[PDB]
Structures are given as C-alpha cells and as structure tokens.
Design a protein around this ligand. Structure first.
Ligand code: NA
Ligand code: NA
Ligand code: NA
Ligand code: NA
Lengths: 97, 98, 96, 86
C-alpha cells in the first residue's frame, strides 16, 4: 500500500531511462538542486516570512532521488547511515521538467 | 521479508525529533538548515566528480552521508508541515509522465 | 576616477532601502531570499553552460540579483564588503 | 587608497591568475558558490566571522563574473535601474 523507498527510486529511474539520455552529470545535477532549492526557498519565505509547498518539496526530492540513482546509491541505506549517527548542444535537458 | 517505506522514514525521523523538547525548527530556520547541508553535498561532489582537488582518502561512504543529510533535513521540513513525501512524489510523477 | 567604489555600492543600496522605511529583512528571511536568487542564477548557468535548458534573462542580471541581496545582508549586519574582501584576500596570501 | 569595484575584480583576477587551473568552469563555479552559501547559512542560523563567511561568497561570486567577463558594476547598475524604473 505504501511505497518502499527503493521503489520511488525505481519509478524515477523508469522515467529518466525512457529518454535514453542517462542522468545529468553530478555538477549539473547540483545546479538542479540549487535551482529547485531556490524555488522552495521562495515559497517558504512567501508563506512563513511575511498545494504549492507540497510540490516545491517534491521537486527537490525528485532531484535528490535522481542524484541518488545517478551514483547508484540507496537512499534508504543513506538514511540509515545518518540516523545511526544522530542516535549515538550538450544539453539533453529534454529529459526532465 | 520487506524494506523501508517513505512513510516509515518520515515517522522514524519524527519519533527521533519528538524526544527533544525543542521539537522542529521554523520554516525559515529549517531552510537555512537545508542550504547548509546542501553546500556540504556540493563541496563533496565538487571534489569527487568536480574540479576541486581529488581527495587522497580512498572511496568511502562520504557521498552517501552527505546525501543522507540533505534527505534528513528535507524530511524534517516535510514532517514539520504535515506533508507526505510519498504523496509529493506522486505529484511530480504525474505532472511529468502524464 | 569616477568608477563606483564598493563602499558606495553598499551606500547606494542603503539609501534605496531607507525609502520604504520598513527596514532590511531579517537575517534568516534574507538568507532565504539569497538562496532564492542563487538557484535562479543556477538555472541560467545550467542553461548557458550546463545540460538543462530553461523554460518560460541576462546572465549579467542574474549575478546582479545575487550581488544585491548579498549587499543588503552585508549592510543590515553593518558589514564592510570591502573589508570583508581584504580579510579574504589576506587569508589566501598570508601565512604562506 | 579606496577600492573601486573593478579594482576588486582585478585583484581577484590576479590571485586566480597565479595558477595554471585558472577559473573553474561555470558549473564547478556554481558549486563553489553553493558550498560557500552553506557555510554562510550556518553562521546566520547559529547567530540569528560573519565578515569572513560573507567575503567568501563575495569572492566566488567575483570569480564567476571574471571568468565570464561580467562587470559587477554594470551588473549592479542594471539591477539598480530595474528597482528604480517601476
Ligand atoms: Na519547484
Ligand atoms: Na551534507
Ligand atoms: Na538571480
Ligand atoms: Na563561507
């Protein structure tokens, strides 16, 4: 009933893989993150500094999953890591938006 | 038998934050918190696949911890606003390959 | 001889701000505003020099938006951007 | 001796000019900013040298401009003009 983190990754990989262009390179992917993080940063100041929030959040989560798959990293396993610690043209852009 | 669900990850975080009297951060504080960990993630990739000098240290789990931190903070910002990441995910996967 | 100094760019801005008379933004609100323009700049860079074209803007302007907000924060916190600079340039050159 | 924006840019150009690598390509430069933005963000959270963490973001920002022949002065004027005109 509730998606396994590993599946959200799979889903996002199905999508990107359909363009037969692979994922954005790490540095490009970073720009993507800063980008969406800037749009999310706008809405948060909009609503708390004077279903948009949900979408501006998903947008970052998307990029974050992309970057994860792009480096063959399990977002789940990465989450466990962090938790453990606390307890102790060349542009194929036709591919995303 | 079974792996971790996105809902459980959000819940896990909330049970963790819930044992602190302070609780969650405000949206604007949480935001600065997020761009902080992003910068570290950025610093790392610039070293591993970027143009800063290649580390001496052999391949580790640095990239995962640096990504796990952004994911953490993002989850924190999501719980604090009663937002379901699983559901937010379906959004993009809808407006995209509609 | 008439090139705009740094000390007066902050000055020209402080003057523009003292019009609205509602003060500069709070450091955290200001920070949010900064990352907003930065990712806006990121959007262009990824378009003109990256691998992701933009939808729906001069490169020069996007940098200016960031320089503006950067200055605003610097001013609100009574900071000399010029001094800040030389401090930085000193770390790079001093102590070998 | 009081510094003009161009001068500052030039001074920075001379530093980067000392080494072979030169300026980082735009996407690498973009990540430098994001890196120094995180650190500045940390201080502003922790408090609300601020002069140091702000100087860093200003340094990288200048580098990017130098590597793309952008005059920060002209940039600052276009952005100022926008605020004025309407
Ligand atoms: Na967005
Ligand atoms: Na990090
Ligand atoms: Na901008
Ligand atoms: Na910094």
């Amino acid at each position: 009933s509730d998606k396994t983190m590993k599946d959200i990754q799979a889903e996002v990989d199905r999508y990107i893989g359909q363009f037969k262009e692979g994922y954005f390179s790490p540095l490009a992917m970073m720009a993507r993150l800063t980008e969406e993080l800037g749009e999310l940063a706008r809405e948060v100041n909009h609503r708390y500094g004077e279903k948009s929030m949900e979408e501006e959040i998903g947008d970052v989560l998307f990029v974050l999953v992309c970057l994860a798959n792009s480096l063959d990293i399990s977002l789940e396993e990465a989450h466990d890591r962090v938790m453990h610690k606390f307890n102790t043209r060349k542009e194929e852009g036709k591919l995303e938006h």
